[PDB]
Amino acid sequence: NPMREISIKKLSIHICARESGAKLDRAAKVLEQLTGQKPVTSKARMTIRNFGIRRNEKIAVHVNVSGKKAYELLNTALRVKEYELKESCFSNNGCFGFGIEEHIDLGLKYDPNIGIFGMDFFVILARPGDRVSKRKRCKSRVGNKQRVYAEDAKKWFVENFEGVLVE
RNA sequence: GAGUUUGGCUGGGGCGGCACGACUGCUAAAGACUAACGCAGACGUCCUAAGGCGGGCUCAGCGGGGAAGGAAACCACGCG
């Protein structure tokens, strides 16, 4: 039963500097300085005039981090929300997330050349043995006795931060 | 002023159309062949990759999530 502990699988952060160009590289230096890795850009699938986007250009930037590096990034962003989350943000399969409004609450000092950006945090939990569906030889399906669920993920949250479940 | 020519198919001929070379499905009666100015369409091009080969991946769509974000922006999990 040490093979049944829940843990942070992967953490995702991304900013939508809507129309590409000069506003991108301001954000692209934020994610690098906050985490420490170069981020990745994203293209638009189709062209929309009501939003003002073409079919091939940048819209957003994101980055995926793991390990113990992601465990402490998750601690700093939660304190900005007083260590409390809405109860309806948890999903069927052990995932939850939230959005940070203003860039300068977590860290990085102002530098008025950049601006203030919003973030988006998403978290994925899991137990060991998840590799059996990601590998190459003998790819398979996990099994229900593993497979973190919603209420299994709530009570993981009130044990590592002493949070509170609104609503 | 001289010599000569001014196609064919066709429910008569002419006007119109091309069933005049040629591809796909049906008419066609469970091997192949099989008619009508029968039905529904397409051809006289286009491509230095839209050709050849190695490697890595999964598509249309649905379900639960995420600051401004809405019917439609992007991230991402579970199925397909």
Assess whether A120 (CB) lies less than 7 A from strand B.
yes
Cβ pair A121, A35 in contact under 8 A: no
Report if CB A104 to strand B is under 7 Å. no
For the CA of A37 and the C1' of B47, the distance in angstroms is 42
User: What is the rounded distance in angstroms from the CA atom of residue A121 to the CA atom of residue A77?
Assistant: 9
CA A165 – C1' B75 distance (Å)?
Answer: 25
Q: Does residue A26 reach within 7 angstroms of strand B, measured from its CB?
A: no
Strands of A121-126's sheet, edge to edge? A40-43, A58-65, A7-15, A121-126, A95-98
Q: What residue type is assigned to position A132 of the chain?
A: V
Give A19-27's long-range contacts (Cβ < 8 A, gap of 24+).
A19/A52, A19/A53, A19/A57, A19/A59, A20/A57, A20/A58, A20/A59, A23/A115, A24/A58, A24/A61, A26/A113, A26/A114, A26/A115, A26/A117, A27/A61, A27/A117
Nearest 5 degrees, angle CA A2-CA A154-CA A117? 110
Q: Would strands A7-15 and A121-126 be described as parallel, antiparallel, or unpaired?
A: antiparallel
- Please give the span between the terminal C-alpha atoms of chain A, in angstroms, as a whole number: 33
**Closest nt to A60 (CA→C1')?**
B74
CA distance linking residue A161 with residue A167, whole number of Å: 18
Rounded to whole angstroms, how far apart are CA atoms A1 and A42?
41
Nearest nucleotide (C1') to alpha carbon of A59: B74
Give the experimental resolution in Å: 2.7
Contact at 8 Å (CB) between A117 and A103? yes
Q: How far is CA A150 from CA A7, A91, A124, A140, in A?
A: 14, 6, 12, 23
Residues paired with A11 in a beta bridge: A65, A123
Q: Tell which strand B nucleotides have any atom below 7 Å from a protein Cβ.
A: 57, 63-79
